[PDB]
Write a protein that binds this ligand. Sequence first.
Ligand SMILES: CN1Cc2c(n(C[C@H](N)C(=O)O)c(=O)[nH]c2=O)C1
Ligand SMILES: CN1Cc2c(n(C[C@H](N)C(=O)O)c(=O)[nH]c2=O)C1
Ligand SMILES: [Cl-]
Ligand SMILES: [Cl-]
Ligand SMILES: [Cl-]
Ligand SMILES: [Cl-]
Ligand SMILES: [Li+]
Ligand SMILES: [Li+]
Lengths: 263, 263
Amino acid sequence: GANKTVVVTTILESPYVMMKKNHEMLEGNERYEGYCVDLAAEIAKHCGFKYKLTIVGDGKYGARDADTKIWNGMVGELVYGKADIAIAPLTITLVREEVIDFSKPFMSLGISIMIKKGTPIESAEDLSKQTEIAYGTLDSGSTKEFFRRSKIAVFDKMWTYMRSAEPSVFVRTTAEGVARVRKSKGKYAYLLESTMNEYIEQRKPCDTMKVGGNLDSKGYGIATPKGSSLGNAVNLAVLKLNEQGLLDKLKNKWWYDKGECGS
Amino acid sequence: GANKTVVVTTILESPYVMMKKNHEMLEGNERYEGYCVDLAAEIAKHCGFKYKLTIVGDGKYGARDADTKIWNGMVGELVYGKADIAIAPLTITLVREEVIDFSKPFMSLGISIMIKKGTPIESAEDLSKQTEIAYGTLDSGSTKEFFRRSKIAVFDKMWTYMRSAEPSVFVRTTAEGVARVRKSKGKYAYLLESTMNEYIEQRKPCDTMKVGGNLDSKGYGIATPKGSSLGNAVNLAVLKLNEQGLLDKLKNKWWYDKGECGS
Ligand SMILES: CN1Cc2c(n(C[C@H](N)C(=O)O)c(=O)[nH]c2=O)C1
Ligand SMILES: CN1Cc2c(n(C[C@H](N)C(=O)O)c(=O)[nH]c2=O)C1
Ligand SMILES: [Cl-]
Ligand SMILES: [Cl-]
Ligand SMILES: [Cl-]
Ligand SMILES: [Cl-]
Ligand SMILES: [Li+]
Ligand SMILES: [Li+]
């Protein structure tokens, strides 16, 4: 049959996808800006398709309910045929790979620690050995799941701490985690993807820091329904953009070129 | 039909694959040791296959001759059906991805600069602006091809330099490049994958250094013939090993645990 407009699912999160300040004046894909908006356009240009940016209905990345077996988030939108491609900071994981197709990574990263400047923490081991400085993750997504599923002693100890700590150490959004770091006088540290940590470190009021090595090493991938023909072309596009240096330029544009915390 | 032993192609290069010191006493897969030997065993264990380690006949990674259209190296062994899987420090590239299947990365890396300690170079830009300190790459493989194909001004200038420099700045093997750094009194710098640079930095006589940021960001993948059923299971195995922390442990074992240059 004839070509059809490709339905892209994504999620609103700076600096990946944001409504432009003047979005009310605009329409369609032009309402949005950010790293993933630019990446979507570069992929579509290379592959020769038209597309529509849509925002994932449930605000989630993708997990399977153990009782109902239903997939939520952007993964679910692909699994159930509601979108044709997901272009987002979506971590490549085994359980997701079993149900959807992923490109090779477009961005490499790991779980990391964000502190308020001056907090006496340098590593996950440091966090794990104490409770005065509380620490936690988002309440959904791959960072939380890393701790929940880990069999590594330090990370298992951290998960047991997080489930039992009071008040709750979990946050609903990145903005909430960052605000909690900023407002807690050194008594909250936030575990989050290194990408995001690096972005926030260059935002005013310039009071957060990434510390320590990353806890793991993984990647974000472009996702398509399992077996979709679009997958091959999108994957080749990711590889081409990487080989041309364009992914590095795009990260610099959205993270550093207009950083707010000096040179 | 019945299961058959899987033919693995790999290449002899420390610390990935080496003949054990006592190899003459041994037989079969047990003759070999190293990171990729251990990785092959972990993949086979997870997937439930028996396998035979073989060494790529032509000593190459994989490129296509522009005139004959023939693929060489480990890629060629897969393309032409001489091996079932390649388990090696084989870079995921667009042109290879078009002809073989790749797992998600098992190791992330980039092109990097190796200097003899004390050489006054900190970046690729520094190299590109001068000729007193000669610099080059292997004479085959993805590092050379990065420069040959680059449209980025600094790297294109470096390629033009490398093709025209005398005496030849290219080397046939990693060992030759390292020896040339070590013997050239600061007048040769070697461009090589960061993985390898990091390994050599922890080898006696402890006279080399990795300097500067990496020039690119890519990955090694396990490769199979295009469409081979083995690909899905191998890819899931890579993801599982990564998620369990085993790939990090394996790098530490072969790079750092017995490093020769201090703690
Ligand atoms: C906006 N980012 C920051 C962030 C994200 N995720 C989702 C994850 N990439 C997934 O795919 O589930 C996390 O799990 N931890 C984080 O710190 C998404
Ligand atoms: C043993 N390593 C070191 C090294 C290798 N390669 C081959 C490359 N991974 C490929 O797949 O062509 C390079 O191109 N540059 C290097 O410095 C393999
Ligand atoms: Cl349409
Ligand atoms: Cl917004
Ligand atoms: Cl057999
Ligand atoms: Cl050997
Ligand atoms: Li998949
Ligand atoms: Li491929």
